[PDB]
Amino acid sequence: SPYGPEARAELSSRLTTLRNTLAPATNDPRYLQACGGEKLNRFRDIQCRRQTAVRADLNANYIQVGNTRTIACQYPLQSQLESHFRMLAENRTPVLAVLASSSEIANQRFGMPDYFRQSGTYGSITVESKMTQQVGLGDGIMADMYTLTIREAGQKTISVPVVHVGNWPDQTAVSSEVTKALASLVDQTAETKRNMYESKGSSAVADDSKLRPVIHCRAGVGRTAQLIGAMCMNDSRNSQLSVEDMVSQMRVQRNGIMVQKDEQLDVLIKLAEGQGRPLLNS
């Protein structure tokens, strides 16, 4: 069977080898390095690829698996928020999906500022937050949506649609049913907002580096990877893109950690099986 133990064992073997090769070496020329005395990485083991980095001071990467373009990043550090907000604005972000739980954000030691559920000032940037709808995703998991309005004198005011899942603990994987519903809500949200910029003849519709959905959890490698992988399968243009392709492309474009827990890769495998999508290549 294309989804039998033998196939699953082979896929893991290839993935394992890749993760070891992409392991960040001290002062690795493939990863972004902290220039100066400013902390860049939230974790010394979760690094950001250099050739796909969005900004030099943020741990974020441009990711494209198949025809699906997104942006994965770590939960911004306190001192990166200003730069984080400019990135969202400039990108004309059609949707921001936050997969970090409320419990993690509340934990003051985790250093994860609640920058989207409350209004505030960060440097030259002014952010206003407003709660909109709440969508049930199944298994009791809920999606809380907000609208972030980013204002900066001299720049055009940009509002961003936010989808926050607060009850998805780290190092865990939600059911494939939930993941499929969450992937749909994010595309719909992005699709609606993107439509707006097109009706306004925005200059971002022509730039492949903009109008990309931004997604992140805590490290931006576990929960973020699961959603992205699910979003690719939603795209009707990724026909024949295998599970091997997806994970490979994510790791080579961010870091070999993308899709941390096996339980997470299992959800992707399950969704692929439901689509008759190949696991391995050739």
């Binding site: 939230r42 974790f43 010394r44 083991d45 979760i46 805590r218 490290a219 490698v221 950690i257």
Partner: peptide, 4 residues
């Protein structure tokens, strides 16, 4: 810190 280490995310592990």
């Amino acid at each position: 810190d280490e995310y592990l």
